[model samples]
Target: CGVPAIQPVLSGLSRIVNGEEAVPGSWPWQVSLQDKTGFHFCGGSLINENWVVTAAHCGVTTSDVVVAGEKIQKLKIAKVFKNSKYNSLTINNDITLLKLSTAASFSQTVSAVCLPSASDDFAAGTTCVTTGWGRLQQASLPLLSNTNCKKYWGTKIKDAMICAGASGVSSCMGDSGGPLVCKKNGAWTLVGIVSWGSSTCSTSTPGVYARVTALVNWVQQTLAAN
Candidate 1:
């Protein structure tokens, strides 16, 4: 979960806008993980002592984790448990857990983002932020209910996916796997994972993200089984 004592009160409104560089350490759980060759592949968030949540489509093996605000440690991935139901074609269940080689060194600059409970809901038009160097964009976007998303995306939209963004606002290239967090009770909690979107990141289209709340139990059960 988030650093309880540090959560700040913020905005929840929605509108189109340009992405800005996040204030340092603001999104503390944000992690830019790279491959062995110093190749940055996807964005992710620290979820616990030894796990990082990211897209199932991202590549693997020995990643260098650069926590949002601090040069903490090099976390080697011990294992990857991509959701067995993940579908590349439909992009359903586009989630994965990277087991770290060791427990992360917890600190103010290095903390895990909280997971939303089953009933934790972010209503349509609720604002949330997705941070990453991917496209080096940190943008605030509004949550679009699954129904509205289906209207634009059609039946390809699945219950496992959440939709956010709007005309002139959305995730850019390289934004994959970053966290979409919304504040709840003064604490920021993970809600979505940057997964996919329209070609050219269509101005009229919303971005499709991994629906964390819907799959929260799967994450819990998967974490428990280990």
Candidate 2:
């Protein structure tokens, strides 16, 4: 028999970024991590039926909930698995996986995204998309080369981070923990997690994202073990 079907991912509709209104249900895996009362703080991606991938810097708590779908289904967090090597000072390994108390039921608007292999590399200058109801209100940005990205952020950018966006278009406050997805082979792939960036989000500076390639091993092992 083949692998069991998880969530159904439907993509390739019109898009967002520069703060345009996103078409309803365009990003099937996007999730909103909210407080117990349902106030959204950070964004997340559904990697499996019961797990979400987000930035460790999100500082999620057990009291937080995961919301998916246009109608918005609120799910409880069973547990949070953060990278052991996560560095709060330097913001390295800034990624986390959240296990839902129950498997998320698939729908036209809720789904899981494919994880990139550790060896996978999307070259610089590749266009990618990020979404959220955060400050920027869902914007698109291009993946910048490490060299140029470092030029703006300087040495604060670690090897574990991938940089994207610039000036007029970038993720701001509350956009953290969102997915940085790239379209490959006609399917959307999770490539990075929104980590940090300038306070003046819409400036010449670029936003930083936790490179998914660096965390693939930890993600796979964690999912398998727990």
Candidate 3:
């Protein structure tokens, strides 16, 4: 399941920060990951019709599935592929790929986002948007250089992570596995995958994401082999 061709944005519209509701089609790629017991938890990105990209730390279980669409659609996960380098202790390489039981039909509320290439430059201070049905809803934050980001999180920040957000806005619980997308040169590109953040929601601290650029090769290879 490779990236899809360009398609018009259908439903979700508008952005919200510091806790506001998002429009129907604003984030068509966002998906909700839930446990077998139907407990809403992490978020994910619809990378293609049959695959979803998310975080490995979510502990995706056999019974877990994905719930997509603003109008709502539930799909069973056929398989779960966690990165080989994923570390539970360090939370390094926090990425996972979910193979959907069937292909997702694209609609006004569903679409795939382009993956980030090594050449894609999303510099520090660049504004990126993250949407989820988590604690805060939607948040707009600026990318932070590793040096600056480390000042806050200390040694927890790894090279594979991208830190973004500010004092007033951040991703909290249930936001992990979502996309951290940015508009570069007028095109929205998947920059990172939401991994972790401060304990509390709606904080000024930066949120950590699994840098997608660094994992592009692994993602492509995994998708190809699996």
Ranking by TM-score: 2, 1, 3
lDDT of 3 by residue, 92-181 (tens): 778898898978888777777778786666789887777777632555777898789889779978878888886465555328888888
**Model 2, global lDDT:** 0.75
- Candidate 1, which ten residues in sequence have the lowest lDDT sum? 5-14
- Residue-pair clashes per prediction, in order, are 2, 3, 8
Cα lDDT of candidate 3 equals: 0.75
TM-score of each: 0.87, 0.88, 0.87
Please say which candidate is ahead in TM-score: 2 or 3: 2
Candidate 3 colliding pairs: 11-25, 12-24, 12-25, 12-26, 13-25, 13-26, 166-204, 167-204
How well does candidate 1 match the true structure in TM-score terms? 0.87
Off by over 4 Å in 1: 4-16, 62-70
Tens-place lDDT per residue, model 2, 60-168, is 9777888886477788999999887799988888989998998888776677777887888877877777777772244566788777888987886777789887746
What tens-digit string does per-residue lDDT give for candidate 1 at 1-226?
A: 6763343323332234445654455677777777776567786888777888888877544555544442666677788878877998887888888888877877766788888888878888887777767634467777797899889789877877988877576555326788887877867788888887777766577877888998888899999977
